[PDB]
Design a protein around this ligand. Structure first.
Ligand code: BEF
Ligand code: BEF
Ligand code: BEF
Ligand code: BEF
Ligand SMILES: [Cl-]
Ligand SMILES: [Mg+2]
Ligand SMILES: [Mg+2]
Ligand SMILES: [Mg+2]
Ligand SMILES: [Mg+2]
Ligand SMILES: [Mg+2]
Ligand SMILES: [Zn+2]
Ligand SMILES: [Zn+2]
Lengths: 513, 505
């Protein structure tokens, strides 16, 4: 079918050449001479696009625009006018013009506007598909052999880019990308299992990990005289950063990086290591009062403010600081109210827990299983949360306050698929990606077993002597109710183990505009 | 802060007059000579906008575009080029350019591009805020006096328009709109309570209501030889329709209307009325085993036969993702039927589960959030692809709902017995004790087509955005339910609901 163009201009005879050109390109043009005729035509037809003059006897083009946009908000309107007046331009933009062309007009400029306003999505979709096919082999090479840490960061960033871009592209491309990501996770699990014990043993040569994060990314700003908000969104994957960065770009410029969470990729271990600057085992040894056992009923992350204080002292720094923890926008609304009273501190730490709650809810909440059924829906829901919770205005307020922001997380999460059998663990019956126990029964081939937890900076109970971790998108399952257990947890989001999504996480340094 | 412009052109010397024009208007222009220089400049700075030539010694501008969009996806890029080749246009569009200007360029056209691409949101917001203030008095007049049903539809449509337009704009203006809406709902409750009984008693002259919907909106299409999908989205109000229609407009043209749900504005009553063509009193009589929506296909069958028609039809209900993906995979097999009825469930918003309840408080705390969630569900559930596939089958689509929901605000006291129903907007009981001035009171359910067991059974309905609260733990339940989304009562949102006739493009 040919696209239809309604063209209102009182001097349409002067546009004959351009109409002929459009008709030769395959467009059907209906010309009218006034804004009232244009309104009537839009009322009784479904034109694909409207071209409007501004200065016409009768109602002006800007008045016609308003009425047309009321009738057919979804139809593009292009203003084609001789006026060079800035206030006309501004009122056209404000009336939701799709484009604005000052006369005289090159007919090819009209063709550009038609392609862009009527076929942008299918043109971008085809170009994406072409570009992915032309890079598919390069990506497979990019993840081959042995990669440096910096190469893993680039690779994972490129895979996430394609995951998002291929939402808007041919499905078969999705299947190809899924399989490439599957391979990347298999290779990354290898990379981690081969080096992990040595990363903990040799702190000087290891990539930035949870206990290094404040020293590497926060202290240098503070020591250079900058005021910093450290915003920890629990359970925030790289692809969620990518989904919210466009919104934040209105208020901040970015320095984007990633770092490695320790194992287990879980709050009790990684987030306390962030805020203490220590491996969990060093927290227990140096500050036994701050470390809560895994078997305890006491909350595991209630000593982060004392931990931060010890970390600041340990490095002989004297920074003033605050610490606030948020679970609901409502207490988040309180914090937003009192946010400017934090302007006295060099360092203001905010923990947002809602995304972690939402993520766990993908297991037991029917609403969340529908709203985050897959990873594209998860990202979309993350964007809606960010925008319509107090988070958006928190970031906007902080920017007005002139603070730099360090936006990061303690770990990500991964959608799990295939079960791994296990038995006999203690106090880890809740977690599906790592277990702690003594006489654990499992297949050593299917996990990463730590038989010496003290070698990788982990404490434990006397009743437990080992950790085991799942890799890739496996999840632990018990035999006694295996088949219900497998059906219930398949395709849920889980953290604690080894994967790109869980361990390779964003840390963004942001400067207000 | 000054807006910064990166401008890559091998002939930037010839563009000195344009640079000067822009610098006089406050723009800071950095000129570079090549695509590689432009990439490096973008990599090491934070320009607000990039102006890019196509044909330059070294890499092509289309190559620079791709890399710049990779580094800074949120930065707009305007192609300024002597090229008029269609394939260059297409590649630029496909590379996500913001604008494409063919040389020679009027410097005022550059200015237009800078305003549109850097200040559009703030320009639209101020225009909306100004335009709302200019209409404020006229809108108050529009809802004054005695409004016909058609005038109620136009007023509600205009209020919803301003509600959505104003969410991208001044917060105080939206608060004024909220008050106007509250006054509209007060006046609409009066319109309903004054007319409700007469409407049910007079099918030949009443506005279109639940039991009339098929007769009024579906059968005339089928009698005209058209084939129809009747898609009913549970609990989908007018502002939710307005939130998803731009997505649908890629595939359909629209004839938009609204109709009135019966009371209670709840699925067991309104949706069974739709599919049977009867009031619930008669439904319960004739389909006791289906009286609470388990299979409605027999109802639809009896409705068709009652009107002496012979339509082939299917009936399908999608509760969750699993079965929506199935239906989508087999959707063309429904081509054998003249009438295909699909029921889609939106997310349950009255779930008392602890988790579901916590999710709602964060994710749907206000109406803008509720609309955003609807758009996300529509796009990433199978719903969007369903509508897309049906459009390829050449069917007319009637898209509708059985009732809406309203965000409740203030409590209304009621005392009932232990068997009293749980709904926050309507109550049924023999022992109900309430202030009659605060509710719409139906002392005899049978006289407005509602079933009941006891002579002393009554229905009472909240109006506006009230909700019922029992005395026991009144303070706890008032805090717990305030600002939740509920249905069953009398409001524009719950009762005046969309029915859209769509034709595939
Ligand atoms: F008269 Be139109 F504005 F060129
Ligand atoms: F509470 Be954390 F996400 F393990
Ligand atoms: F050399 Be540019 F394309 F005008
Ligand atoms: F099922 Be409906 F939302 F009452
Ligand atoms: Cl070990
Ligand atoms: Mg004119
Ligand atoms: Mg005029
Ligand atoms: Mg050139
Ligand atoms: Mg070149
Ligand atoms: Mg009675
Ligand atoms: Zn965590
Ligand atoms: Zn968690």
């Amino acid at each position: 079918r040919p696209y239809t163009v309604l063209w209102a201009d009182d001097e349409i005879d002067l546009l004959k050449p351009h109409i002929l050109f459009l008709e030769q390109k395959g467009y059907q043009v209906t010309p009218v001479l006034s804004g009232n005729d244009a309104i009537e035509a839009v009322q009784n037809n479904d034109f694909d696009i409207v071209f409007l003059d501004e200065n016409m006897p009768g109602i002006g083009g800007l008045d016609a625009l308003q009425k047309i946009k009321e009738l057919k908000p979804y139809t593009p309107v292009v203003m084609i006018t001789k006026s060079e007046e800035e206030h006309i331009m501004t009122q056209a933009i404000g009336g939701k013009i799709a484009d604005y062309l000052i006369k005289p007009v090159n007919p090819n400029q009209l063709l550009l506007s038609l392609k862009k306003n009527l076929q942008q999505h299918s043109i971008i979709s085809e170009t994406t598909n072409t570009n992915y096919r032309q890079e598919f082999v390069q990506l497979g090479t990019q993840m081959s052999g042995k990669l440096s840490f910096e190469e893993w960061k680039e690779l994972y960033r490129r895979i996430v880019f394609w995951e998002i871009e291929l939402e808007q592209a041919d499905r078969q491309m999705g299947e190809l990308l899924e399989m490439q990501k599957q391979e990347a996770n298999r290779l990354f699990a290898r990379f981690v299992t081969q080096n992990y014990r040595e990363w903990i043993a040799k702190p000087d040569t290891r990539p930035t990990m949870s206990p290094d994060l404040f020293k590497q990314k926060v202290f240098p700003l503070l020591d250079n005289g900058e005021k910093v908000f450290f915003i920890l969104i629990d359970n925030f994957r790289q692809d969620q950063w990518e989904s919210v960065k466009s919104m934040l770009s209105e208020f901040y410029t970015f320095e984007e990086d990633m770092y490695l969470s320790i194992l287990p990729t879980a709050t009790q271990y990684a987030r306390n290591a962030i805020f203490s600057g220590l491996m969990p085992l060093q927290i227990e040894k140096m500050f036994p009062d701050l470390w809560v056992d895994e078997e305890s009923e006491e909350g595991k992350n209630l000593n982060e403010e004392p931990m931060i204080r010890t970390l600041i002292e340990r490095y002989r720094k004297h920074y003033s600081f605050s610490y606030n923890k948020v679970y609901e926008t409502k207490f988040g609304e309180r914090l937003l109210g009192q946010i400017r009273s934090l302007s006295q501190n060099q360092l203001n730490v905010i923990v947002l827990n809602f995304v972690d709650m939402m993520s766990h809810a993908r297991t037991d909440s029917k609403m969340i299983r529908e709203l985050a059924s897959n990873e594209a829906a998860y990202r979309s829901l993350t964007k809606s949360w960010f925008k319509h919770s107090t988070t958006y205005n928190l970031f906007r307020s902080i920017a007005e306050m002139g603070y730099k922001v360090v936006l990061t997380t303690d770990h990500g999460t991964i959608q799990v698929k295939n079960p791994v059998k296990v038995i006999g663990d203690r106090s880890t019956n809740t977690n599906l990606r790592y277990k702690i126990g003594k006489n654990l029964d499992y297949n050593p081939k299917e996990v990463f077993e730590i038989k010496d937890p003290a070698s990788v900076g982990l404490p434990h109970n006397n009743l437990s002597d080992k950790f085991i971790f799942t890799k890739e998108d496996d999840f632990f399952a018990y035999p006694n109710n295996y088949n219900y257990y497998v059906q219930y947890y398949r395709n849920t989001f889980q953290h604690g183990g080894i994967s790109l999504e869980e361990m390779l996480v964003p840390v963004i340094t942001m400067q207000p505009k």
